């Protein structure tokens, strides 16, 4: 018999027994999160360790198959996930020491404590408190001290750990036929199947700068606006030739500039749109919010929600000793089980996050008919992009008024539109250069271009140049800024958000054309458009069974990743930046430093 038939039989044996175990593990995890009790902890442990102890031998038998003659691009693709060595390439000692290192690194990062000189006994952590102090305060010196303490009592001891972790991961990747860990991370954006839609690992690297180059003028104008606002802010700190330091970004790493939105208000007198008080006046609970959002999704064209979601899934306010961690999540337990995990309240952010999670759940049903190993998106960004598209499109004033919240006579003018556009830009595009520089730094440090001594200086100089962030206090080699990061201390990819922003902008823009809407892109509404919903479901149904290059062919007409939705969205804001500061010059100089 041919090898393909044997592989098909092996997959048929594997998937049926694997789906039940995965469902059991997911149900145990959901029970543990729904009921915070001691017994649920070992219940989850004993229902989750068996999944790994089964998948290990399932992947063990998928090596004797000669995976060089299987065809149809699906059976081989399905077996490739089974043909994954994982971390067994190295010996037991190296693997166990890496596991212990990761565990202790996570514990140290989660146990970051900094004590003020006045009270060396009571420290402060990254939980609200120290983080709250350095986010919504006014004093410059205390913010600088907090930043120095965070970078000095956390990142100092992680330097040797990261130094050995990088080389160990590179060695394991080399044992896994991957010369670099960056190549291992980019392997998600790699397809070698149908002719004309194939992609290479190195293509993503060049595409990153080829899509980042054209957004540079917008970032430079936004930086000039921020510097002008800082001129309106504290004097004798920021120079009009240089750029602002790290701790004035408003965040511990400067990912988001939402905390600086108050300091950079465009006009001030115009307030943002908010009907939370109107929501309360109409007696809006979580049930009403969810029902209205589901009606909006139905008007979009998404399939009707099945029964059991309202019952099995937890919605709001567990209340008493029956505790439950309710970090907003969308759970796909398998076997036709989809749930939400929430603590919803009367606020705009809760509305948008509920829309986000239920869109994630809808996408989960979208690829439900696909096999177990193909019940995911084409790449890591599509899932989050589809989740956030509905939240982005449901915040328009037209949608707020259409659901009986805004007044029927409400009229929007240019000032509030500019305010909303600036607020959205300060949160969306304010992290793209940071993501780009972080990803490039991680990629080259995994490749090995920069030596051990040239580790911090390169990172800081590229932050000064590309991003425009200078040193508030100098650090030569004894700290590690990337070490004090969630995605670096936990081995999480960060290019996912970079791809996700462009993907969601592309999909929203394409729906805007195929939704019969005219006007500014920020006011575009995808509601009451069955054709747009069907077009979206055309790609959502594809799931992981199709390449991401083929996935980027139904929503938009271009397979390659284009960035023109980002510029098309902020056109009025870009013109406002053009004609507002006619005296100041954009850009920054890297020679200037706050300390020297």
């Amino acid at each position: 018999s041919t090898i393909e038939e044997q592989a098909k039989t092996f997959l048929d044996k594997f998937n049926h027994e694997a789906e039940d175990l995965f469902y059991q593990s997911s149900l145990a995890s959901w029970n543990y999160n729904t009921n915070i009790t001691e017994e649920n902890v070992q219940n989850m442990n004993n229902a989750g360790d068996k999944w790994s102890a089964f998948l290990k031998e399932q992947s063990t038998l998928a090596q004797m198959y000669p995976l060089q003659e299987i065809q149809n691009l699906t059976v081989k693709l399905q077996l490739q996930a089974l043909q994954q060595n994982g971390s067994s390439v190295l010996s037991e000692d190296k693997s166990k020491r890496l596991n212990t290192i990761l565990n202790t690194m996570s514990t140290i990062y989660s146990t970051g404590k900094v004590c003020n000189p006045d009270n060396p006994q009571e420290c402060l952590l990254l939980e609200p408190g120290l983080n709250e102090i350095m986010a919504n305060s006014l004093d410059y010196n205390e913010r600088l001290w907090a930043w120095e303490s965070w970078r000095s009592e956390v990142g100092k001891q992680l330097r040797p750990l990261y130094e050995e972790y990088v080389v160990l991961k590179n060695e394991m990747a080399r044992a896994n036929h991957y010369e670099d860990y960056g190549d291992y991370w980019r392997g998600d954006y790699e397809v070698n199947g149908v002719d004309g839609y194939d992609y290479s690992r190195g293509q993503l690297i060049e595409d990153v700068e080829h899509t980042f180059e054209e957004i540079k003028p917008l970032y430079e104008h936004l930086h000039a606006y921020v510097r002008a606002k800082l001129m309106n802010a504290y004097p004798s700190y920021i120079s009009p030739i240089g750029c602002l330091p790290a701790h004035l970004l408003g965040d511990m790493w400067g990912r988001f500039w939402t905390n600086l939105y108050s300091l950079t208000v465009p006009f001030g007198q115009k307030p943002n749109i908010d009907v939370t008080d109107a929501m309360v006046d109409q007696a809006w609970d979580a049930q009403r919010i969810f029902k209205e959002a589901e009606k909006f999704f139905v008007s979009v064209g998404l399939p009707n929600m099945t029964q059991g979601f309202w019952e099995n899934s937890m919605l709001t306010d567990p209340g008493n000793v029956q505790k439950a961690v309710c970090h907003p999540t969308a759970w796909d337990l398998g076997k036709g089980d989809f749930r939400i995990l929430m603590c919803t309240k009367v606020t705009m952010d809760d509305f948008l996050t509920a829309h986000h999670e239920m869109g994630h759940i809808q996408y989960d049903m979208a690829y439900a008919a696909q096999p177990f190993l193909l019940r995911n998106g084409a790449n890591e960004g599509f899932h989050e992009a589809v989740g956030e598209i509905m939240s982005l499109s449901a915040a328009t004033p037209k949608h707020l008024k259409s659901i009986g919240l805004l007044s029927p006579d409400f009229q929007e003018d240019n000032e509030t539109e500019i305010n909303f556009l600036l607020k959205q830009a300060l949160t969306i595009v304010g992290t793209l250069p940071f993501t780009y520089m972080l990803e490039k730094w991680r990629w080259m440090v995994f490749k090995g271009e920069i030596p051990k001594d040239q580790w911090m200086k390169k990172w800081w100089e590229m932050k000064r140049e590309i991003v425009g962030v200078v040193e508030p206090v100098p650090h030569d080699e004894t700290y590690c800024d990337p070490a004090s990061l969630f995605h670096v201390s936990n081995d999480y990819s960060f290019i996912r958000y970079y791809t996700r922003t462009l993907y969601q902008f592309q999909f929203q823009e394409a729906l805007c054309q195929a939704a019969k809407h005219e006007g500014p892109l920020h006011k575009c509404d995808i509601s009451n458009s069955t054709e747009a919903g069907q077009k979206l479901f055309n790609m959502l149904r594809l799931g992981k069974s199709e390449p991401w290059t083929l996935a980027l062919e139904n929503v938009v007409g271009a397979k390659n990743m284009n960035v023109r939705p980002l510029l098309n969205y902020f056109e009025p804001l870009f013109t406002w930046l053009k004609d507002q500061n006619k005296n100041s010059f954009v850009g920054w100089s890297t020679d200037w430093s706050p300390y020297a």
Partner: protein, 98 residues
């Protein structure tokens, strides 16, 4: 706790003829080598149990299916409905089907 008392045939040498009932439970050979009744490589059990759960979605919950087959061969027919009857009238010119 999961109902695993119901099983179904998963691997067979070929299809099944109409109105045929097979209960064979023997190891399945997916290659050109004997298994000797051992679930080794290319050796799978033809029967797989079901994992019915009350929390499973619609379409995975256990369903009961019964087919009724009607035949009419040379022997006289004997299964059919009650052939309901009307009431009785008298002393009037009518027509009857006694």
């Amino acid at each position: 706790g999961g109902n695993y008392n119901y099983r179904y045939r998963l691997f067979r040498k070929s299809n099944l003829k109409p109105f045929e009932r097979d209960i064979s439970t023997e190891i399945y050979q997916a290659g050109s080598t004997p298994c000797n009744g051992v679930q080794g490589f290319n050796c799978y059990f033809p029967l797989q149990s079901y994992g019915f759960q009350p929390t499973n979605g619609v379409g995975y919950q256990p369903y009961r299916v019964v087919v009724l087959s009607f035949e009419l061969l040379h022997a006289p027919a004997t299964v059919c409905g009650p052939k309901k009857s009307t009431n009785l009238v008298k002393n009037k010119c009518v027509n009857f089907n006694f």
